[PDB]
């Protein structure tokens, strides 16, 4: 069963972490760009996307962090199999 396996858990955790990090102001988002000093500052969005989320979390943040989460998860899954851990 794929569900609950090591591969599935890592991908769900990595995807969840990026969404959680971005939503709670731990990663850059659509409304917060990052300065040269790796600090979050307000940004200007040409196509201001309306969102009812109290923090302004838009659907773009989901796609941005969904792909970022998948990239992180895929690397970990394949990396562990490389060293024999997985």
């Amino acid at each position: 069963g794929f569900i609950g396996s090591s591969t599935n858990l890592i991908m769900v955790a990595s995807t969840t972490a990026t969404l959680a990090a971005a939503r709670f102001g731990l990663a850059p988002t659509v409304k917060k760009n990052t300065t040269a000093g790796l600090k979050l500052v307000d940004s200007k969005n040409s196509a201001g996307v309306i969102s009812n989320d109290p923090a302004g979390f838009t659907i773009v943040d989901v796609l941005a962090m969904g792909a970022a989460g998948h990239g992180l998860g895929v690397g970990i899954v394949l990396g562990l199999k490389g060293i024999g851990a997985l």
């Binding site: 591969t7 988002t29 659509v30 940004s43 040409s46 792909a67 394949l78």
Partner: protein
């Protein structure tokens, strides 16, 4: 925060033949019509100089965009012709059965004035001109097995050519993008990185995984081409694919479950060359384009367009600011979004350098089946793509100087990297000047040292492997490091990327496909010739760019323009001071430097790599005479030019007799060019006066007054004929030679 959006103007221009009947309409000067023959040349010279027809950037951009559709449409006609001639006038089908004995041919001549002798005996019951373009090897790799498949591609090529010409007309006469559209550099890079290169690589991986790999796996096994399954049968029937590659039995579940190791059977990392065909494994090539697809698709999400996330290219440039460089990269973003010439200067430089890198990598890692053992194709492709790279780089200097004269504005450039470079140009050119003199003495002087010592009967005093030695120790170390890479630094690679590093030779059909290349004293000497001739070409072109606007001789050179002959005989003489003349001189040195590169390649391969495998060992075409002979200028004259030109001068009466004719004709055009280079239009204008008098005497004098060519056109006509004659001479000499023996 200007939004990224589509912006056009409706019906900007009217489609009429009115202006087709009014030559010179584009320019105010030429619109009045001709009075002297100089007008005719000016019409063609300034036709595509859009930046000088109008001062409106938007109008310039729209012409560039549509002129590019015309270039694309022309390539499709050319590509369509190559595929069509393969279907109708080629022996491709016979070649598939016996690739090692049948010479590729895709051109046939009509039987007129006795030219049918050029239809040589190429094999497969076919008569035609042998081709060195390598199209047969490319078609085999992709999986083409019938002339019907070639025919359909040609028809598709013409449809694409029609679409390209429609697009050019549509986007100039019907819906022309506005200037703000052209200036979305962030958006363009995103689409061109992830969309053009990224999806293009992924799409081609799909073809290789589903068409090329199955077809070539059976072809190598010896299956008759007509009995191989058709590509669509492979696509529709997963059962067939499972037989060739069992991984297909599991579908795409491994891809989504991250069990990517399941696909190890067709996504390999072998390295080396396929022993049966002598070319790269297609399974390796598929994993290459899959990896490249992911890298570029990720690369296409870097720049900010409409949704906040991403980078601003202006912000990156302005943040990279150091203590040694004043303001830094400030102002470059405005330069590179308002000057087409500045963009062209960069792109030509790297596009040309890429074409040269292609030449080196394709010969060392032959990517197509039966490409290596076809010595005519290996020599032609390496030489073709080196010449293309050479011309592009010289163009990069030409259009860097055009930017410096026309698009450069001091107000926007104050104490930035560009400004500071101009402020120590004497330091740069003086140092680069000395480096060239140093490299000329210590590389070409060694050849003169060897030639004199050899003529004096003092071989022990020469620079050679049996005498004073100059070993490329640094290059030899790198060859050994790459040879041992699979053991420790690339553990998951089975073999070295190329057989040039070391190991054992691969032989296909009794001929060597690739074997280790040894670097000795001769290789040391020739390489430092390359560094010398390249550094001189940089000196000429860089000098033209840095001194385009002014110098200690002409303080106001910018006002004179980019292309003028001189500023008169004053100050001792100022002939050829314009930046255009630095391109004119740079073309000669580029031709000089690349000629040695392709002579180095031709002699080294025949001497040390190419040859016939036999029981005793490898016998090379020129028998390993490069090491002992290429250390003197006399050796090159006798062993390379005089000995190998035997084939071309004995070509008369055979199918190669055409190369003999072009060999003489090329010699003629080259010498003809020296008439324009060694003379000046002052003599010729006076000569035409006497010739015009004879016509006046007979009431047959023209209404358009004859004029001797301008000063600049004499130099342009001279260099064009000089290059054509020189390059065509080598072209005939190479093909008649390698086809005859290789």
């Amino acid at each position: 925060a200007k939004k990224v959006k589509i912006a056009v103007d409706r019906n900007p221009v009217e489609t009429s033949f009115e202006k087709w009947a009014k030559p010179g309409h584009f320019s105010r000067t030429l619109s009045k019509g001709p009075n002297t023959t100089t007008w005719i040349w000016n019409l063609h010279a300034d036709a595509h100089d859009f930046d000088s027809h109008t001062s409106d950037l938007e109008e310039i951009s729209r012409k560039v965009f549509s002129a590019h559709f015309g270039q694309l449409g022309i390539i499709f006609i050319w590509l369509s012709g190559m595929y069509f001639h393969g279907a109708r006038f080629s022996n491709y089908e016979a070649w598939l059965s016996d690739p090692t004995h049948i010479k590729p041919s895709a051109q046939v001549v009509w039987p007129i004035v006795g030219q049918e002798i050029l239809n040589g005996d190429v094999g497969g019951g076919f008569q035609g001109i042998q081709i060195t373009s390598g199209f047969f090897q490319l078609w085999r790799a992709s999986g083409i097995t019938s002339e019907l498949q070639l025919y359909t591609t040609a028809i598709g090529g013409l449809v694409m050519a029609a679409a390209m010409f429609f697009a050019g007309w549509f986007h100039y006469h019907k819906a022309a993008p506005k200037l703000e559209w052209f200036q979305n550099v962030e958006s363009m890079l995103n689409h061109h990185l992830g969309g053009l290169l990224g999806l293009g690589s992924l799409a081609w991986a799909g073809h290789q995984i589903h068409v090329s790999l199955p077809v070539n796996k059976l072809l190598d096994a010896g299956v008759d081409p007509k009995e191989i399954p058709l590509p669509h049968d492979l696509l529709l029937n997963r059962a067939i694919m499972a037989d060739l590659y069992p991984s297909f039995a599991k579908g795409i579940a491994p891809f989504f479950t991250l069990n990517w190791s399941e696909y190890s059977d067709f996504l390999t990392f072998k390295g080396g060359l396929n022993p049966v065909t002598g070319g790269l494994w297609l399974s390796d090539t598929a994993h290459h384009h899959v990896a490249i697809a992911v890298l570029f698709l990720v690369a296409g999400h870097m720049y900010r367009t409409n949704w906040g996330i991403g980078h601003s290219m202006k912000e990156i440039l302005e943040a990279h600011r150091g203590p040694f460089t004043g303001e830094g990269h400030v102002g470059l973003y405005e330069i590179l979004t308002t000057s087409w010439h500045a963009q062209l200067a960069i792109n030509l430089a790297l596009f040309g350098s890429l074409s040269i890198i292609v030449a080196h990598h394709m010969y060392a890692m032959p990517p197509y089946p039966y490409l290596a053992t076809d010595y005519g194709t290996q020599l032609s492709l390496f030489t073709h793509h080196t010449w293309i790279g050479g011309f592009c780089i010289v163009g990069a200097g030409a259009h860097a100087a055009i930017f410096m004269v026309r698009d450069y504005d001091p107000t926007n450039n104050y104490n930035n990297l560009l400004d500071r470079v101009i402020r120590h140009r004497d330091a740069i050119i003086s140092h680069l000047n000395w480096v060239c003199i140093f490299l000329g003495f210590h590389s070409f002087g060694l050849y003169i040292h060897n030639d004199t010592m050899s003529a004096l009967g003092r071989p022990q005093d020469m620079f050679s492997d049996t005498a004073i030695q100059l070993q490329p120790v640094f290059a030899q170390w790198i060859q050994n490091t790459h040879f041992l890479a699979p053991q420790l630094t690339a553990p998951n690679a089975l073999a070295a990327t190329s057989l040039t590093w070391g190991g054992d030779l691969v032989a296909v059909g009794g001929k060597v496909a690739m074997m280790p290349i040894s670097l000795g004293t001769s290789d040391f000497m020739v390489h430092h010739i390359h560094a010398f001739t390249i550094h001189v070409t940089v000196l000429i072109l860089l000098k033209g760019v840095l001194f385009a606007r002014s110098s200690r001789l002409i303080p106001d050179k910018a006002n004179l323009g980019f292309r003028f002959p001189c500023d008169g005989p004053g100050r001792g003489g100022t002939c050829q001071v314009s930046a255009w003349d630095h391109v004119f001189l740079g073309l000669f040195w580029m031709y000089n430097s690349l000629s040695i590169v392709i002579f180095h390649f031709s002699w080294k391969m025949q001497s040390d790599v190419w040859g016939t495998v036999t029981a005793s060992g490898v016998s090379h075409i020129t028998g390993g005479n490069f090491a002992q002979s290429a250390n003197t200028i006399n050796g090159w004259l006798r062993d390379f030019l005089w000995a190998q030109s035997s084939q071309v001068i004995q070509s008369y009466g055979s199918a190669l007799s055409a190369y003999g004719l072009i060999f003489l004709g090329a010699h003629f055009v080259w010498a003809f060019s020296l008439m324009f280079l060694f003379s000046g239009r002052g003599y010729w204008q006076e000569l035409i006066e006497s010739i015009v008098w004879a016509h006046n005497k007979l009431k047959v004098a023209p209404a358009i007054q004859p004029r001797a060519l301008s000063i600049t056109q004499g130099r342009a006509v001279g260099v064009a004929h000089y290059l054509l004659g020189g390059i065509a001479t080598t072209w005939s000499f190479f093909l008649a030679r390698i086809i005859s023996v290789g």
